[PDB]
From Swiss-Prot, chain A:
Gene name of this polypeptide: MED26
Stretch of the intact protein here: 480 to 600 of 600
Organism: Homo sapiens (Human)
Protein name: Mediator of RNA polymerase II transcription subunit 26
Subcellular location(s) of the protein: Nucleus
Classification of source organism: Eukaryota, Metazoa, Chordata, Craniata, Vertebrata
Chain's role: Component of the Mediator complex, a coactivator involved in the regulated transcription of nearly all RNA polymerase II-dependent genes. Mediator functions as a bridge to convey information from gene-specific regulatory proteins to the basal RNA polymerase II transcription machinery. Mediator is recruited to promoters by direct interactions with regulatory proteins and serves as a scaffold for the assembly of a functional pre-initiation complex with RNA polymerase II and the general transcription factors.
Subunit structure: Component of the Mediator complex, which is composed of MED1, MED4, MED6, MED7, MED8, MED9, MED10, MED11, MED12, MED13, MED13L, MED14, MED15, MED16, MED17, MED18, MED19, MED20, MED21, MED22, MED23, MED24, MED25, MED26, MED27, MED29, MED30, MED31, CCNC, CDK8 and CDC2L6/CDK11. The MED12, MED13, CCNC and CDK8 subunits form a distinct module termed the CDK8 module. Mediator containing the CDK8 module is less active than Mediator lacking this module in supporting transcriptional activation.
Family: Belongs to the Mediator complex subunit 26 family.
UniProtKB/Swiss-Prot annotation, chain B:
Shown residues in whole-protein numbering: 63 to 159 of 244
Keyword Transcription: yes
Predominant location: nucleus
Designated gene of the protein: MED19
Keyword Nucleus: yes
GO molecular function: transcription coregulator activity
Domain of life: Eukaryota
Annotated protein name in UniProt: Mediator of RNA polymerase II transcription subunit 19
GO BP terms: positive regulation of transcription by RNA polymerase II; positive regulation of transcription elongation by RNA polymerase II; positive regulation of transcription initiation by RNA polymerase II; RNA polymerase II preinitiation complex assembly
Coiled coil stretches, renumbered: none
UniProt family annotation: Belongs to the Mediator complex subunit 19 family.
Curated annotation (Swiss-Prot), chain C:
Family: Belongs to the Mediator complex subunit 10 family.
Description of how the protein assembles with itself and partners: Component of the Mediator complex, which is composed of MED1, MED4, MED6, MED7, MED8, MED9, MED10, MED11, MED12, MED13, MED13L, MED14, MED15, MED16, MED17, MED18, MED19, MED20, MED21, MED22, MED23, MED24, MED25, MED26, MED27, MED29, MED30, MED31, CCNC, CDK8 and CDC2L6/CDK11. The MED12, MED13, CCNC and CDK8 subunits form a distinct module termed the CDK8 module. Mediator containing the CDK8 module is less active than Mediator lacking this module in supporting transcriptional activation.
Native organism: Homo sapiens
Protein name as annotated: Mediator of RNA polymerase II transcription subunit 10
Function of the molecule: Component of the Mediator complex, a coactivator involved in the regulated transcription of nearly all RNA polymerase II-dependent genes. Mediator functions as a bridge to convey information from gene-specific regulatory proteins to the basal RNA polymerase II transcription machinery. Mediator is recruited to promoters by direct interactions with regulatory proteins and serves as a scaffold for the assembly of a functional preinitiation complex with RNA polymerase II and the general transcription factors.
Part of the intact protein present: 69 to 128 of 135
Location of the protein in the cell: Nucleus
UniProtKB/Swiss-Prot annotation, chain D:
Entry function: Component of the Mediator complex, a coactivator involved in the regulated transcription of nearly all RNA polymerase II-dependent genes. Mediator functions as a bridge to convey information from gene-specific regulatory proteins to the basal RNA polymerase II transcription machinery. Mediator is recruited to promoters by direct interactions with regulatory proteins and serves as a scaffold for the assembly of a functional preinitiation complex with RNA polymerase II and the general transcription factors.
Family stated for the protein in its record: Belongs to the Mediator complex subunit 7 family.
Subunit structure and binding partners: Component of the Mediator complex, which is composed of MED1, MED4, MED6, MED7, MED8, MED9, MED10, MED11, MED12, MED13, MED13L, MED14, MED15, MED16, MED17, MED18, MED19, MED20, MED21, MED22, MED23, MED24, MED25, MED26, MED27, MED29, MED30, MED31, CCNC, CDK8 and CDC2L6/CDK11. The MED12, MED13, CCNC and CDK8 subunits form a distinct module termed the CDK8 module. Mediator containing the CDK8 module is less active than Mediator lacking this module in supporting transcriptional activation.
Localization in the cell: Nucleus
Gene name in the database record: MED7
Protein name per its UniProtKB record: Mediator of RNA polymerase II transcription subunit 7
Lineage: Eukaryota, Metazoa, Chordata, Craniata, Vertebrata
Modification(s) after translation: Constitutively sumoylated.
Length: 97, 75, 60, 78
């Protein structure tokens, strides 16, 4: 608190950057006016459950991406939001077992 | 549109520490003058223990009768 | 006490003026580094977030 | 995203407080203000925590179902 020195300030730098971290970002998702219980109110049907099981749904069953690669919830996404060599690594959302 | 909890910033240049405080406080000419009074007073007198006692009293803080009772001889 | 040291008290005036300018120099320097840091931050955020810093420079 | 951008712009306005008038009343409000913003950024993502919880049950069930069928098929081949 009282004093910050070159070596200690650089320690702060590497610790903060290792905690935190041509585009390769996720494809943007717009707002969603049809939501299933409140918004659109679909009576329980069947197309929605078959889409949530088998197909690709980019807001529900995974995160899509530029360069095309699909990632569902149990996988870890490697990206690079900056123009550097440092890569963001989004951890899995679920982490089964 | 507007960000959450925007507000009004203060008056553009009020009193800061980035101004020249001395020139605003009319003290410039004294500094331009300034940038011993023992010696400047020894311009008047001879030179400048019990004077340590003078400074210690500084750090601490019947005339006709005296002339009549001041009897002492010459030699 | 400076009279006890036998100097001029004018030296004490000089030293009070010098300490006033020393504090004013230090405070203006800290405010100047904050100015440079704010400028750098808005430069880099305008690089990384275009539209948001555009709307901020609009609102000011 | 709004609260992220609001946090950054209120940090810039706190820098404007420190540049212009550090003795103002507003900085106390400002040092409260972004605090409230930070609270909301936590309070929204804690609302992802039941959802995440429910969702991990869903994928566990799917994996459970798939593994059952795989063993069935494995055994039938044997």
């Amino acid at each position: 608190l009282s004093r910050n020195e070159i070596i200690q300030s650089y320690l702060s730098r590497q610790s903060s950057l290792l905690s935190s971290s041509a585009r390769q970002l996720h494809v943007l998702v717009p707002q969603s006016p049809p939501t299933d219980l409140p918004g659109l109110t679909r009576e329980v049907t069947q197309d929605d459950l078959d889409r949530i099981q088998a197909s690709q749904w980019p807001g529900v069953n995974g995160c899509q991406d530029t360069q095309g690669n699909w990632y569902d919830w149990t996988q870890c996404i490697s990206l690079d939001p900056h123009g550097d060599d440092g890569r963001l690594n989004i951890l899995p959302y679920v982490c089964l077992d | 549109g507007p960000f959450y909890l925007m507000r009004e910033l203060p008056g553009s240049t009020e009193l800061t520490g980035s101004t020249n405080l001395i020139t605003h406080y009319n003290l410039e000419q004294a500094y331009n003058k300034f940038c011993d009074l023992p010696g400047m007073i020894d311009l008047p007198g001879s030179h400048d223990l019990r004077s340590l006692i003078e400074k210690p009293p500084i750090l601490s803080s019947g005339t006709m009768l005296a002339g009549f009772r001041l009897h002492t001889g010459p030699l | 006490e400076y009279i006890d040291q036998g100097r001029n008290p004018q030296l004490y005036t000089k030293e009070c003026l010098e300490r006033a300018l020393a504090k004013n120099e230090q405070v203006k320097g800290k405010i100047d580094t904050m100015k440079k840091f704010k400028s750098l931050l808005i430069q880099e955020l305008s690089k990384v977030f275009p539209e948001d810093m555009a709307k901020y420079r609009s609102i000011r | 995203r709004k609260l992220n951008m609001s946090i950054l712009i209120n940090f810039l306005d706190l820098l404007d407080i420190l540049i212009r008038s550090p003795g103002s009343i507003k900085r106390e409000e400002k040092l409260e203000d972004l605090k409230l913003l930070f609270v909301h950024v936590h309070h929204l993502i804690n609302e992802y925590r039941p959802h995440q919880a429910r969702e991990t049950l869903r994928v566990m069930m799917e994996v459970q179902k798939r593994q059952r069928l795989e063993t069935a098929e494995r055994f039938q081949k044997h």
